[PDB]
C-alpha cells in the first residue's frame, strides 16, 4: 500500500494549495471559506474524477484572496479566522486546530491517505472522548462511535434495529470535536468509527477519488449551515404536507379512495393526503390510470380536492418487459441501462410485472421523455409522487450481477448510490418545467447526499414481517433513524405508521402498538400511515378507544401547524431538521448523546413517545431550563435531570420549555379548511427579566416564491418583570406576502393568578368573561379585551391582527 510520504514542495493557485509528496502523489487543500476546507488526496497527482460531484452545488463559501502558506523548517502553516492548519513535511500529515490550539482533526501517523491499487482510505487520530453522529438514514443508536457503516443503497424489507446498509447513502457525519465531514464519493464507502482500533478512525472507498470536505463549527448548527452552503437549501413541501397522510399497499382504485376520503371526514379524523400505491398505473411505468380500477380519474381527483384531499401517486424507475409498447420504445431510444457484457439493455428481475428495463436517468435525453410520461396524472390534478424502489430494488451487495449495469455516466459500482438520486432529480426538474412556480411533493426511498434539493424521504419497509405484534423495538428505532435522517438533510421525513411489515391478523391485539406508533408518527413532518397489501391501517381500524386517542394525536399536530410550518421554513434557511436530536440544541450536555427515546420538535417542544409494550410511564431526560407538561400546562420540572412521568395509552409525553411562545391554529380537517383563522399564542413566561420570543412565519404555502424570500413574519416577544409581564406583538415584517385576514390573535399567557389589569399601550383593557372574548372571534375584528380562566391558569388577551406593533402590559 501507498502513503503520501514526504512533502517536498507546495504550489498556490487562488484558494487552492497543492502539496507534492512521494512518487507523483499530491494532496490539495482548498479554502472554500475560513471554516470549510475541501481536501483532495491523489495517488497519481492528476486531480480528475469520472463524474463531478452530484451533491455539491457551490464551492465558493466566501473565502477572499489567495491561500497564504507560511513555510517553517519542518512544517507549513495555514491560518483562517477559525482554523490553524499545521502540515508536517516529513512525512506529510494534515493537522487542523481551532484558534485556541486544541487539535480537532489529525492524520494518523504516516497513513493519513492510503492507496492500495485504487482502494482509497483516510485514517485519522481518534481520541477517547470523540463521539460521532449522522451518516443519514441509518439504524442503531444515534451515537455511531464504535461501529462501522457502509454506503450501498439496499432493499432489506422488515429490517432490524441494527441493519446496515439501508436505502439511502448520505456520507456526511459530525464529530463531537465540532467538525463535520462530507465524503464526496459515490462508491461503496465505509466508515469505521473506532470499530477496528481505539487509536484511529477511517473512511474509505473501493475506487474513485479521495475528496472530502472538512466543515468546522462552534456547534452542530454551524456545521449543518456549512453543509447546506455546499449541498443546497432544503426545498419546503406544500403547506398541506404537514397534515396527516394515509396509504396502503392496495390503495390502487377509485371506489376505495372515495370511500376512504368520506370515512375520514365522517369520523372527523383530520387528513390531507391520500396516497396511491404502484398498482395505480396500468403498467410499469406508463402513468396511465389502471382501467379496471379507475372509471373517472379526473372526477375522482377533483371530488377529493373539493373535500380537501390531495393525491400523491407512486412511481418505480423501471419499464416492465410485459409493458411491450413502452419497453420497446425505451429500448429503441437507448433509454435503458445497458449490460456491459452484451451492449444491450440490462435484463433486470423485478417483484411485480416481470423482468424489466431499468430507466437510465443519467442519460440527458431521458429527462424530457420521463417528464412527459409523469405529467399525465399531474394534468388530472395529482399533486406529486413517491419515488419507490430506486436503490435500485433487488440490488443488494450480494446481487453481484448488477455490477454489469453500464449507465450513461458510469458503471454500476459508481452509479448505484446515485441511481435513485439522479432519478429523483429528473422527477423534480421535470415537475418544475411542466408546472412552473409550484412546490413539488416528492417523497423518496433511495437517495444520496444533496437529496434535500429535490425530495423528501420515508424510511421504507419497517416493522416485523414474522409477527407484526413483535415490532416494538423496530418502531422504537425509527426515532434515531428519523433524527439521523434529519441530520443528513431529510428535514421532511416520515416512517410507515404501523410499520410496513406483518399481517394484522388481530386488530385488538395490534391496537396498542398502532396507537404508540401513531403517537410518535404525528411528530414526524410527513406523518403517513401505511402497511403491506390489504392490511388496512386507517386510524379507526383498531376500535373506538384507539380511534379516539388517534384523533387526538392527529388533532394536536394540526393545532401545531403554524409552529411546525415556522420550523419547516427554518429547515430551508438553516438546514436544521424539524425533529432534532437534543444534542443539536444542547451540545454541551453529553447526556444527550445517549438519547434514542426522545427528541425536540423545533426548540420549544420536547417529545418523549412511549415505545415499550405495556408501558404506562416514560423516563424523560430534561436538558437545561425549566420544562412544563404541555398536556396540562401546570406541572413544572427543573432541568438537567432524568424524570419518570405517567404516560398511559391515551398520553404522549410532551414538554414545553419555560420561556416558549407557541403559535397554534384551531382544529381543522385539512390544512386551509378555514382559509383564514384566529391564531393563538401560548406564552409560558421566562425567568425575571429574560426576553424570549417566537417569529411566526407565513407564506403562500404552494409556490416557489419562498425560495426568493417572499413571505411575512410576525415576532411575538415576552419579558417578565417584578409583578409585570410585557408581551410585544411586533410590527409585521412584509417581504412581498401578506397573510390571510382579517383575523384576531389570542395571546394566552400562562400564569398562577388573575392579574389586576391588562393594558394595550397606555389604554386599560376591559376584563370580560371567556365566552365574550370568544364570541365572533372569526367575524368581529374591532374588539380588544381580556379574560381569565382559573381552571387552566390562562390570561387570554384578544387583539386584531392589524400588522402594527403593540405592547401588552399585564399588571400582576
Ligand atoms: O402491486 C404491487 C405491490 O404493491 C404494494 O407494494 C409496493 C411497496 O413497494 C415497496 O416495498 C415500498 O417500500 C412500499 O412502501 C410499497 O407499498 C403492496 O404492498 C403489495 O401487496 C403489492 O404486491
TrEMBL record:
<protein>
    <submittedName>
        <fullName>Candidate alpha-glycosidase Glycoside hydrolase family 31</fullName>
        <ecNumber>3.2.1.20</ecNumber>
    </submittedName>
</protein>
<dbReference type="InterPro" id="IPR000322">
    <property type="entry name" value="Glyco_hydro_31_TIM"/>
</dbReference>
<dbReference type="InterPro" id="IPR011013">
    <property type="entry name" value="Gal_mutarotase_sf_dom"/>
</dbReference>
<dbReference type="InterPro" id="IPR048395">
    <property type="entry name" value="Glyco_hydro_31_C"/>
</dbReference>
<dbReference type="Pfam" id="PF13802">
    <property type="entry name" value="Gal_mutarotas_2"/>
</dbReference>
<feature type="domain" description="Glycosyl hydrolase family 31 C-terminal">
    <location>
        <begin position="575"/>
        <end position="662"/>
    </location>
</feature>
<dbReference type="InterPro" id="IPR025887">
    <property type="entry name" value="Glyco_hydro_31_N_dom"/>
</dbReference>
<comment type="similarity">
    <text>Belongs to the glycosyl hydrolase 31 family.</text>
</comment>
<dbReference type="GO" id="GO:0005975">
    <property type="term" value="P:carbohydrate metabolic process"/>
</dbReference>
<feature type="domain" description="Glycoside hydrolase family 31 N-terminal">
    <location>
        <begin position="48"/>
        <end position="191"/>
    </location>
</feature>
<keyword id="KW-0326">Glycosidase</keyword>
<dbReference type="Pfam" id="PF17137">
    <property type="entry name" value="DUF5110"/>
</dbReference>
<feature type="domain" description="Glycoside hydrolase family 31 TIM barrel">
    <location>
        <begin position="234"/>
        <end position="566"/>
    </location>
</feature>
<keyword id="KW-0732">Signal</keyword>
<dbReference type="InterPro" id="IPR017853">
    <property type="entry name" value="GH"/>
</dbReference>
<dbReference type="Pfam" id="PF21365">
    <property type="entry name" value="Glyco_hydro_31_3rd"/>
</dbReference>
<dbReference type="Pfam" id="PF01055">
    <property type="entry name" value="Glyco_hydro_31_2nd"/>
</dbReference>
<dbReference type="InterPro" id="IPR033403">
    <property type="entry name" value="DUF5110"/>
</dbReference>
<dbReference type="GO" id="GO:0004558">
    <property type="term" value="F:alpha-1,4-glucosidase activity"/>
</dbReference>
<dbReference type="InterPro" id="IPR013780">
    <property type="entry name" value="Glyco_hydro_b"/>
</dbReference>
<feature type="disulfide bond">
    <location>
        <begin position="158"/>
        <end position="501"/>
    </location>
</feature>
<dbReference type="GO" id="GO:0030246">
    <property type="term" value="F:carbohydrate binding"/>
</dbReference>
<feature type="domain" description="DUF5110">
    <location>
        <begin position="678"/>
        <end position="751"/>
    </location>
</feature>
<keyword id="KW-0378">Hydrolase</keyword>
